[PDB]
Amino acid sequence: GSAVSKTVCKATTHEIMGPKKKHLDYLIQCTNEMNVNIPQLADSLFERTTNSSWVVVFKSLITTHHLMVYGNERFIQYLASRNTLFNLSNFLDKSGLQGYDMSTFIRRYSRYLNEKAVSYRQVAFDFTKVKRGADGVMRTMNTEKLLKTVPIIQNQMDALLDFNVNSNELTNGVINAAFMLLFKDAIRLFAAYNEGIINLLEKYFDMKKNQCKEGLDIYKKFLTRMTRISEFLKVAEQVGIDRGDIPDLSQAPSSLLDALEQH
Amino acid sequence: GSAVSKTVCKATTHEIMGPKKKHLDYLIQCTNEMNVNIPQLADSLFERTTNSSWVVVFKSLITTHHLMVYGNERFIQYLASRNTLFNLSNFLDKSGLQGYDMSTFIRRYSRYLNEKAVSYRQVAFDFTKVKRGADGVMRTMNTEKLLKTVPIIQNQMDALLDFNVNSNELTNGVINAAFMLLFKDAIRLFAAYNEGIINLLEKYFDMKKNQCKEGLDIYKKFLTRMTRISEFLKVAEQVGIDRGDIPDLSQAPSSLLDALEQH
């Protein structure tokens, strides 16, 4: 409570680096305790995002992201249940050049985090977290739900890619901490998008005419997203990310000749 | 051969970023093919380190590191069988300031890579790669070999920590790629050092007097290394590394009161 609220402040000091691991780990433990009040933990993070300083605001967003990824699922479930989340579409810290230039990333990052919560609200699970493979949800989900879902992944993916950062803009520890988490979400979200597309291709011949039609449009839009993804992983390569962590895209884009199976 | 040698050149161009993932992956496949001549692959990498340019030389070192970590074990086994490895103790690229400042990291990195090979030669396995836990080598190894080994881990660890970089020196994609690999080795090497110490503590009461003595000296030196390690992970924290990848050190340094069991 006070211990929770004090820890949120320590994670979000004015210092120019990401939130410290020691504060994060305590926050993560907080989300795992049946007695902690999640809403109050959340409200403290929202309050920090009314600060005028870019450093404070960006650290509060990063903290929220890290709790969505590593915290108990009850945290994201609450965030997904509110009606309003971050409203930082007009944020601008004019106190210095660093401020002006970081303000833009703040806007774009906060939009991604909003879209991450809305996606959870819409499908009741986290795309980044569920079983992968052949025994997984995204591989074994009926044709109707699939057609419904893949479009939600696509949307979360676009918001993620709109961060649109270049290597030469990654110049302090705050934005770099955000980028490292964005990287982790991007690779998992891609895996789930790919699996979904694999299921589709599998069932696209045995399906109704108008379905086939919607299908077509998803594979269609997946291929343009593949290219944007490649541009993103190339930023990652430029920055120095271990090439073993960067996934290989040499997978599933040759068959656009079902644009005729609608005979 | 020519395909191998051409790929080494592409990994080590003059461009200021780490070696590209596409060239690395082909090199890794090379190490997995029973027909590829390992020595010739190696010699090409050594030849690149006679270039006068810091970029070329640092990329050749990074490529070698990445093959030691992700390549077939036959690669490191060969490197460990030569008598001379890198000799870059006097390297200096004076062509520009970036050169002067990178030269020092080149020296220190090459020493680490030498020590990684020598360690493999000495114990016949890679500390970063073996089974961890309670069913592992480092947890289940007899008292005699243990006393022999832990000192080799310690030595590899010191060479690794002598890289001695600050966050404000991580300023281009080449040195950042080196650092990301160093990070991966550091966390695994620590795990193995910790496991070793756990075995020791376990057997330190049931052992000879002079052994106990040597033991003492290893726990002794492990505690000072713990501190240096903490300083290293703090650089990692400053740079923006996902705090979930950074391990928690809150483990095994309270018992220095066996410095009296030698009664």
Task: List the CATH number of the domain containing B211.
Answer: 1.20.58.150
Examine the domain organization and report whether B13 and B41 are in the same domain: yes
Half-sphere exposure of A142 (CA within 13 A, CB side): 2
Burial of A236 (0-12, 13-18, 19+ CB in 10 A): buried
Which among B15, B9, B49, B7 has a CA at the least distance from the CA of B31? B7
Q: Would you tell me the crossing angle of helices B38-48 and B21-31 to the nearest 10 degrees?
A: 140
Residue A167 shares a structural domain with residue A213: yes
Interface contact flag, A241 B25, Cβ < 8 Å = no
- Asked whether residue A84 falls in the same domain as residue A165, the answer is no
| Experimental method, per PDB record | X-ray
- A181 CA to chain B: closest CA distance, Å? 6
* Resolution value (Å, 1 decimal): 2.0
Question: For residue B18, which residues of chain A lie inside 8 Å, CB to CB?
Answer: 237, 240, 243
Q: Let me know whether A147 and A116 are in one domain.
A: no
CATH number, domain at B85? 1.25.40.90
- Asked whether residue B136 is domain-assigned, the answer is no
Measured CA to CA, the distance from residue B185 to residue B53 in angstroms comes to: 26
Mapping DSSP onto H, E and C, the string for chain B reads CHHHHHHHHHHCCCCCCCCCHHHHHHHHHHHCCCCCCHHHHHHHHHHHCCCCCHHHHHHHHHHHHHHHHHCCHHHHHHHHHCCCCCCCCCCCCCCCHHHHHHHHHHHHHHHHHHHHHHHHHHHCCCCCCCCCCCCCCCCCCCHHHHHHHHHHHHHHHHHHHCCCCCHHHCCCHHHHHHHHHHHHHHHHHHHHHHHHHHHHHHHCCCCCHHHHHHHHHHHHHHHHHHHHHHHHHHHHHHHCCCHHHCCCCCCCCCCCCCCCCCC
Per DSSP, helices labelled H in A38-164 are 38-48, 54-70, 73-81, 97-123, 143-161
Which of B33-65 are b and which e, b meaning 16 or more Cβ less than 10 Å from the residue's Cβ? eeebebeebbebbeebbeeeebbbbbbbbbbbb
Structural domain includes residue A63: yes
B242, A179: Cβ pair inside 8 Å? Answer: no
- Neighbour tally for A180: CB within 10 Å: 22
Q: Under an 8 A CB cutoff, do A240 and B180 touch? A: yes
- Running DSSP on this structure, what letter comes out for residue A83? S
In-domain check, residue B130? no
As a whole number of Å, the end-to-end CA separation of chain A is: 64
**Euclidean distance between CA atoms A198 and A88, whole angstroms:** 37
- Contact predicate B18/B62, CB 8 Å: yes
Supply the range of the domain harboring residue B93.
1-124
Please indicate, yes or no, if residue A3 is contained in any of the structural domains. yes
Query: Which domain-ending residue is among A92, A124, A156?
Result: A124
Alpha helices in A162-208, H assignment, sequence order: 173-203
In this structure, are B96 and B197 located in the same domain? no
Nearest-by-Cβ selection for B184 from A18, A179, A242: A242
Q: What angle do helix axes B54-70 and B73-81 make, rounded to 10 degrees?
A: 120
> Is the sign of the CA dihedral B104, B106, B112, B117 positive or negative?
negative
Would an 8 Å CB–CB cutoff place A71 in contact with chain B? no
Task: Name the closest residue on chain B to residue A20, using Cα atoms.
Answer: B237
Q: Domain check: are A106 and A154 in the same one?
A: no
Residue A132 belongs to some domain of the structure? no
Tell me whether residues A17 and B241 touch, CB distance under 8 A.
Answer: no
Q: How far separated are the first and last CA of chain B, in Å rounded?
A: 64
Residue B184, chain A, CB below 8 Å: the answer is yes
Long-range contacts of A28-31 (CB under 8 A, 24+ apart): A28/A66, A28/A67, A28/A70, A28/A71, A30/A4, A31/A67, A31/A71, A31/A72, A31/A74, A31/A75
Give the chain B residue nearest A171 (alpha carbons). Answer: B171
CB contact under 8 A, B177 and A25: no
A17 interaction partners in chain B (CB closer than 8 Å): 237-238, 240
* B26 near A CB under 8 A: no
Q: Are residues B160 and B254 in the same domain?
A: yes
The answer to whether B75 and B67 have CB atoms below 8 angstroms apart is yes
Structural domains in chain B (count): 2
Instruction: Assess whether B111 and B159 both reside in one domain.
Output: no
The residue type of B190 is F
Contact B78, B42 (CB under 8 A): yes
> Is there a single domain that holds both residue B175 and residue B114?
no
| Number of neighbours of residue A263 by Cβ within 10 angstroms | 4
Q: Is A184 in contact with B21 (Cβ distance < 8 A)?
A: no
Three-state SS at A128: coil
Pair A59, A155 in one domain: no
DSSP state of A77: H
Instruction: Please check whether residues B85 and B155 belong to one and the same domain.
Output: no
